[PDB]
PDB file of all heavy atoms in Angstrom:
ATOM      1  N   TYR A   1     -37.337  -6.727 -82.642  1.00  0.00           N
ATOM      2  CA  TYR A   1     -36.043  -7.259 -82.250  1.00  0.00           C
ATOM      3  C   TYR A   1     -35.047  -7.170 -83.405  1.00  0.00           C
ATOM      4  O   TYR A   1     -35.418  -7.095 -84.580  1.00  0.00           O
ATOM      5  CB  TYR A   1     -36.175  -8.708 -81.782  1.00  0.00           C
ATOM      6  CG  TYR A   1     -35.072  -9.150 -80.847  1.00  0.00           C
ATOM      7  CD1 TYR A   1     -35.007  -8.669 -79.546  1.00  0.00           C
ATOM      8  CD2 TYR A   1     -34.097 -10.045 -81.265  1.00  0.00           C
ATOM      9  CE1 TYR A   1     -34.001  -9.069 -78.687  1.00  0.00           C
ATOM     10  CE2 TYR A   1     -33.086 -10.449 -80.414  1.00  0.00           C
ATOM     11  CZ  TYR A   1     -33.043  -9.959 -79.126  1.00  0.00           C
ATOM     12  OH  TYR A   1     -32.039 -10.359 -78.275  1.00  0.00           O
ATOM     13  N   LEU A   2     -33.760  -7.178 -83.050  1.00  0.00           N
ATOM     14  CA  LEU A   2     -32.714  -7.095 -84.063  1.00  0.00           C
ATOM     15  C   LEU A   2     -32.639  -8.363 -84.905  1.00  0.00           C
ATOM     16  O   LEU A   2     -32.214  -8.308 -86.065  1.00  0.00           O
ATOM     17  CB  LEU A   2     -31.364  -6.807 -83.401  1.00  0.00           C
ATOM     18  CG  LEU A   2     -30.866  -7.766 -82.313  1.00  0.00           C
ATOM     19  CD1 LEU A   2     -29.977  -8.860 -82.893  1.00  0.00           C
ATOM     20  CD2 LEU A   2     -30.134  -7.001 -81.220  1.00  0.00           C
ATOM     21  N   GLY A   3     -33.043  -9.502 -84.349  1.00  0.00           N
ATOM     22  CA  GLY A   3     -32.974 -10.756 -85.073  1.00  0.00           C
ATOM     23  C   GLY A   3     -34.290 -11.504 -85.126  1.00  0.00           C
ATOM     24  O   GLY A   3     -35.338 -10.915 -85.408  1.00  0.00           O
ATOM     25  N   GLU A   4     -34.245 -12.812 -84.855  1.00  0.00           N
ATOM     26  CA  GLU A   4     -35.450 -13.631 -84.915  1.00  0.00           C
ATOM     27  C   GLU A   4     -36.407 -13.349 -83.764  1.00  0.00           C
ATOM     28  O   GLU A   4     -37.588 -13.697 -83.860  1.00  0.00           O
ATOM     29  CB  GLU A   4     -35.076 -15.115 -84.935  1.00  0.00           C
ATOM     30  CG  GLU A   4     -34.762 -15.703 -83.569  1.00  0.00           C
ATOM     31  CD  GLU A   4     -33.391 -15.299 -83.060  1.00  0.00           C
ATOM     32  OE1 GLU A   4     -32.513 -14.993 -83.894  1.00  0.00           O
ATOM     33  OE2 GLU A   4     -33.192 -15.289 -81.827  1.00  0.00           O
ATOM     34  N   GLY A   5     -35.933 -12.734 -82.686  1.00  0.00           N
ATOM     35  CA  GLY A   5     -36.800 -12.420 -81.567  1.00  0.00           C
ATOM     36  C   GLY A   5     -37.167 -13.603 -80.700  1.00  0.00           C
ATOM     37  O   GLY A   5     -38.296 -13.673 -80.197  1.00  0.00           O
ATOM     38  N   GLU A   6     -36.240 -14.545 -80.507  1.00  0.00           N
ATOM     39  CA  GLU A   6     -36.483 -15.734 -79.699  1.00  0.00           C
ATOM     40  C   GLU A   6     -36.058 -15.555 -78.246  1.00  0.00           C
ATOM     41  O   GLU A   6     -35.680 -16.534 -77.589  1.00  0.00           O
ATOM     42  CB  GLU A   6     -35.775 -16.941 -80.314  1.00  0.00           C
ATOM     43  CG  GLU A   6     -36.588 -18.226 -80.277  1.00  0.00           C
ATOM     44  CD  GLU A   6     -37.596 -18.313 -81.405  1.00  0.00           C
ATOM     45  OE1 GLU A   6     -37.508 -17.497 -82.348  1.00  0.00           O
ATOM     46  OE2 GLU A   6     -38.476 -19.197 -81.351  1.00  0.00           O
ATOM     47  N   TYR A   7     -36.099 -14.323 -77.729  1.00  0.00           N
ATOM     48  CA  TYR A   7     -35.739 -14.088 -76.334  1.00  0.00           C
ATOM     49  C   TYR A   7     -36.689 -14.821 -75.393  1.00  0.00           C
ATOM     50  O   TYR A   7     -36.253 -15.482 -74.443  1.00  0.00           O
ATOM     51  CB  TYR A   7     -35.741 -12.586 -76.044  1.00  0.00           C
ATOM     52  CG  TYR A   7     -34.636 -12.133 -75.117  1.00  0.00           C
ATOM     53  CD1 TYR A   7     -33.451 -11.615 -75.621  1.00  0.00           C
ATOM     54  CD2 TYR A   7     -34.779 -12.219 -73.738  1.00  0.00           C
ATOM     55  CE1 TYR A   7     -32.438 -11.198 -74.779  1.00  0.00           C
ATOM     56  CE2 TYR A   7     -33.772 -11.805 -72.888  1.00  0.00           C
ATOM     57  CZ  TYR A   7     -32.604 -11.294 -73.415  1.00  0.00           C
ATOM     58  OH  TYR A   7     -31.597 -10.880 -72.573  1.00  0.00           O
ATOM     59  N   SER A   8     -37.994 -14.718 -75.653  1.00  0.00           N
ATOM     60  CA  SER A   8     -39.045 -15.394 -74.882  1.00  0.00           C
ATOM     61  C   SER A   8     -38.914 -14.983 -73.420  1.00  0.00           C
ATOM     62  O   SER A   8     -39.016 -13.780 -73.126  1.00  0.00           O
ATOM     63  CB  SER A   8     -38.971 -16.897 -75.163  1.00  0.00           C
ATOM     64  OG  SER A   8     -37.947 -17.509 -74.398  1.00  0.00           O
ATOM     65  N   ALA A   9     -38.695 -15.908 -72.489  1.00  0.00           N
ATOM     66  CA  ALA A   9     -38.591 -15.590 -71.068  1.00  0.00           C
ATOM     67  C   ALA A   9     -37.455 -16.387 -70.438  1.00  0.00           C
ATOM     68  O   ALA A   9     -37.592 -16.971 -69.361  1.00  0.00           O
ATOM     69  CB  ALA A   9     -39.915 -15.854 -70.352  1.00  0.00           C
ATOM     70  N   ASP A  10     -36.311 -16.426 -71.121  1.00  0.00           N
ATOM     71  CA  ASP A  10     -35.167 -17.177 -70.623  1.00  0.00           C
ATOM     72  C   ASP A  10     -34.651 -16.575 -69.321  1.00  0.00           C
ATOM     73  O   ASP A  10     -34.606 -15.354 -69.155  1.00  0.00           O
ATOM     74  CB  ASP A  10     -34.054 -17.201 -71.671  1.00  0.00           C
ATOM     75  CG  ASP A  10     -33.740 -15.823 -72.217  1.00  0.00           C
ATOM     76  OD1 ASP A  10     -34.579 -14.913 -72.056  1.00  0.00           O
ATOM     77  OD2 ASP A  10     -32.653 -15.650 -72.809  1.00  0.00           O
ATOM     78  N   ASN A  11     -34.259 -17.447 -68.395  1.00  0.00           N
ATOM     79  CA  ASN A  11     -33.765 -17.038 -67.089  1.00  0.00           C
ATOM     80  C   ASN A  11     -32.424 -17.703 -66.819  1.00  0.00           C
ATOM     81  O   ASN A  11     -32.106 -18.758 -67.373  1.00  0.00           O
ATOM     82  CB  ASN A  11     -34.762 -17.389 -65.977  1.00  0.00           C
ATOM     83  CG  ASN A  11     -36.195 -17.068 -66.355  1.00  0.00           C
ATOM     84  OD1 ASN A  11     -37.069 -17.934 -66.313  1.00  0.00           O
ATOM     85  ND2 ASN A  11     -36.443 -15.817 -66.725  1.00  0.00           N
ATOM     86  N   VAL A  12     -31.636 -17.069 -65.953  1.00  0.00           N
ATOM     87  CA  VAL A  12     -30.314 -17.555 -65.579  1.00  0.00           C
ATOM     88  C   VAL A  12     -30.190 -17.525 -64.062  1.00  0.00           C
ATOM     89  O   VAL A  12     -30.630 -16.572 -63.410  1.00  0.00           O
ATOM     90  CB  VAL A  12     -29.190 -16.727 -66.239  1.00  0.00           C
ATOM     91  CG1 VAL A  12     -29.134 -17.006 -67.732  1.00  0.00           C
ATOM     92  CG2 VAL A  12     -29.396 -15.241 -65.983  1.00  0.00           C
ATOM     93  N   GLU A  13     -29.602 -18.580 -63.503  1.00  0.00           N
ATOM     94  CA  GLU A  13     -29.421 -18.662 -62.061  1.00  0.00           C
ATOM     95  C   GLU A  13     -28.347 -17.685 -61.594  1.00  0.00           C
ATOM     96  O   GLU A  13     -27.460 -17.288 -62.355  1.00  0.00           O
ATOM     97  CB  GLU A  13     -29.045 -20.087 -61.651  1.00  0.00           C
ATOM     98  CG  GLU A  13     -30.188 -21.085 -61.753  1.00  0.00           C
ATOM     99  CD  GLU A  13     -30.270 -21.740 -63.118  1.00  0.00           C
ATOM    100  OE1 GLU A  13     -29.425 -21.425 -63.982  1.00  0.00           O
ATOM    101  OE2 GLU A  13     -31.179 -22.569 -63.328  1.00  0.00           O
ATOM    102  N   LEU A  14     -28.437 -17.298 -60.324  1.00  0.00           N
ATOM    103  CA  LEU A  14     -27.498 -16.372 -59.712  1.00  0.00           C
ATOM    104  C   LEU A  14     -26.939 -16.986 -58.435  1.00  0.00           C
ATOM    105  O   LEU A  14     -27.362 -18.059 -57.995  1.00  0.00           O
ATOM    106  CB  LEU A  14     -28.158 -15.019 -59.414  1.00  0.00           C
ATOM    107  CG  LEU A  14     -28.676 -14.240 -60.625  1.00  0.00           C
ATOM    108  CD1 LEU A  14     -29.404 -12.980 -60.182  1.00  0.00           C
ATOM    109  CD2 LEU A  14     -27.537 -13.900 -61.572  1.00  0.00           C
ATOM    110  N   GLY A  15     -25.974 -16.287 -57.838  1.00  0.00           N
ATOM    111  CA  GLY A  15     -25.329 -16.766 -56.639  1.00  0.00           C
ATOM    112  C   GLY A  15     -26.157 -16.513 -55.399  1.00  0.00           C
ATOM    113  O   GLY A  15     -27.245 -15.922 -55.437  1.00  0.00           O
ATOM    114  N   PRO A  16     -25.636 -16.974 -54.259  1.00  0.00           N
ATOM    115  CA  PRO A  16     -26.362 -16.796 -53.005  1.00  0.00           C
ATOM    116  C   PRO A  16     -26.391 -15.336 -52.598  1.00  0.00           C
ATOM    117  O   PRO A  16     -25.481 -14.562 -52.944  1.00  0.00           O
ATOM    118  CB  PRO A  16     -25.553 -17.642 -52.005  1.00  0.00           C
ATOM    119  CG  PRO A  16     -24.179 -17.680 -52.577  1.00  0.00           C
ATOM    120  CD  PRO A  16     -24.349 -17.666 -54.070  1.00  0.00           C
ATOM    121  N   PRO A  17     -27.414 -14.910 -51.865  1.00  0.00           N
ATOM    122  CA  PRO A  17     -27.492 -13.513 -51.431  1.00  0.00           C
ATOM    123  C   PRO A  17     -26.660 -13.270 -50.177  1.00  0.00           C
ATOM    124  O   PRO A  17     -26.233 -14.194 -49.484  1.00  0.00           O
ATOM    125  CB  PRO A  17     -28.983 -13.317 -51.153  1.00  0.00           C
ATOM    126  CG  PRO A  17     -29.458 -14.670 -50.734  1.00  0.00           C
ATOM    127  CD  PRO A  17     -28.590 -15.689 -51.439  1.00  0.00           C
ATOM    128  N   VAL A  18     -26.442 -11.986 -49.893  1.00  0.00           N
ATOM    129  CA  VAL A  18     -25.678 -11.569 -48.723  1.00  0.00           C
ATOM    130  C   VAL A  18     -26.056 -10.129 -48.408  1.00  0.00           C
ATOM    131  O   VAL A  18     -26.509  -9.386 -49.281  1.00  0.00           O
ATOM    132  CB  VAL A  18     -24.152 -11.725 -48.960  1.00  0.00           C
ATOM    133  CG1 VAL A  18     -23.637 -10.644 -49.899  1.00  0.00           C
ATOM    134  CG2 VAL A  18     -23.396 -11.721 -47.638  1.00  0.00           C
ATOM    135  N   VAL A  19     -25.879  -9.736 -47.149  1.00  0.00           N
ATOM    136  CA  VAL A  19     -26.222  -8.388 -46.712  1.00  0.00           C
ATOM    137  C   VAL A  19     -25.075  -7.439 -47.035  1.00  0.00           C
ATOM    138  O   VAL A  19     -23.902  -7.826 -47.057  1.00  0.00           O
ATOM    139  CB  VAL A  19     -26.558  -8.376 -45.208  1.00  0.00           C
ATOM    140  CG1 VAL A  19     -27.418  -7.170 -44.862  1.00  0.00           C
ATOM    141  CG2 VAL A  19     -27.256  -9.668 -44.809  1.00  0.00           C
ATOM    142  N   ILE A  20     -25.421  -6.174 -47.289  1.00  0.00           N
ATOM    143  CA  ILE A  20     -24.428  -5.152 -47.612  1.00  0.00           C
ATOM    144  C   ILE A  20     -24.163  -4.201 -46.452  1.00  0.00           C
ATOM    145  O   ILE A  20     -23.242  -3.372 -46.547  1.00  0.00           O
ATOM    146  CB  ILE A  20     -24.846  -4.344 -48.859  1.00  0.00           C
ATOM    147  CG1 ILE A  20     -25.812  -5.156 -49.724  1.00  0.00           C
ATOM    148  CG2 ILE A  20     -23.624  -3.941 -49.671  1.00  0.00           C
ATOM    149  CD1 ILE A  20     -26.477  -4.350 -50.817  1.00  0.00           C
ATOM    150  N   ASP A  21     -24.934  -4.287 -45.371  1.00  0.00           N
ATOM    151  CA  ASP A  21     -24.751  -3.381 -44.244  1.00  0.00           C
ATOM    152  C   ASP A  21     -23.391  -3.601 -43.588  1.00  0.00           C
ATOM    153  O   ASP A  21     -22.877  -4.720 -43.529  1.00  0.00           O
ATOM    154  CB  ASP A  21     -25.868  -3.578 -43.218  1.00  0.00           C
ATOM    155  CG  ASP A  21     -25.837  -2.536 -42.117  1.00  0.00           C
ATOM    156  OD1 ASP A  21     -26.128  -1.355 -42.405  1.00  0.00           O
ATOM    157  OD2 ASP A  21     -25.524  -2.897 -40.964  1.00  0.00           O
ATOM    158  N   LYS A  22     -22.808  -2.505 -43.096  1.00  0.00           N
ATOM    159  CA  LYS A  22     -21.483  -2.577 -42.486  1.00  0.00           C
ATOM    160  C   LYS A  22     -21.494  -3.436 -41.228  1.00  0.00           C
ATOM    161  O   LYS A  22     -20.552  -4.197 -40.980  1.00  0.00           O
ATOM    162  CB  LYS A  22     -20.973  -1.170 -42.173  1.00  0.00           C
ATOM    163  CG  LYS A  22     -22.026  -0.242 -41.585  1.00  0.00           C
ATOM    164  CD  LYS A  22     -21.510   1.183 -41.483  1.00  0.00           C
ATOM    165  CE  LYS A  22     -22.559   2.109 -40.891  1.00  0.00           C
ATOM    166  NZ  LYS A  22     -22.071   3.513 -40.797  1.00  0.00           N
ATOM    167  N   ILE A  23     -22.548  -3.323 -40.415  1.00  0.00           N
ATOM    168  CA  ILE A  23     -22.642  -4.135 -39.205  1.00  0.00           C
ATOM    169  C   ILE A  23     -22.770  -5.612 -39.561  1.00  0.00           C
ATOM    170  O   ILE A  23     -22.159  -6.476 -38.918  1.00  0.00           O
ATOM    171  CB  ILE A  23     -23.816  -3.655 -38.332  1.00  0.00           C
ATOM    172  CG1 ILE A  23     -23.661  -2.169 -38.005  1.00  0.00           C
ATOM    173  CG2 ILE A  23     -23.896  -4.471 -37.051  1.00  0.00           C
ATOM    174  CD1 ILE A  23     -24.920  -1.529 -37.461  1.00  0.00           C
ATOM    175  N   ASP A  24     -23.571  -5.926 -40.582  1.00  0.00           N
ATOM    176  CA  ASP A  24     -23.712  -7.313 -41.014  1.00  0.00           C
ATOM    177  C   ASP A  24     -22.395  -7.861 -41.550  1.00  0.00           C
ATOM    178  O   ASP A  24     -22.039  -9.014 -41.284  1.00  0.00           O
ATOM    179  CB  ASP A  24     -24.812  -7.421 -42.069  1.00  0.00           C
ATOM    180  CG  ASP A  24     -26.162  -6.964 -41.551  1.00  0.00           C
ATOM    181  OD1 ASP A  24     -26.223  -5.893 -40.909  1.00  0.00           O
ATOM    182  OD2 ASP A  24     -27.164  -7.670 -41.789  1.00  0.00           O
TER     183      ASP A  24
END
């Protein structure tokens, strides 16, 4: 790693899902 290497397994929340189909 470029630094101390404390990335570990950090996670970040995301928004709600949605469909991409044109009909949907």
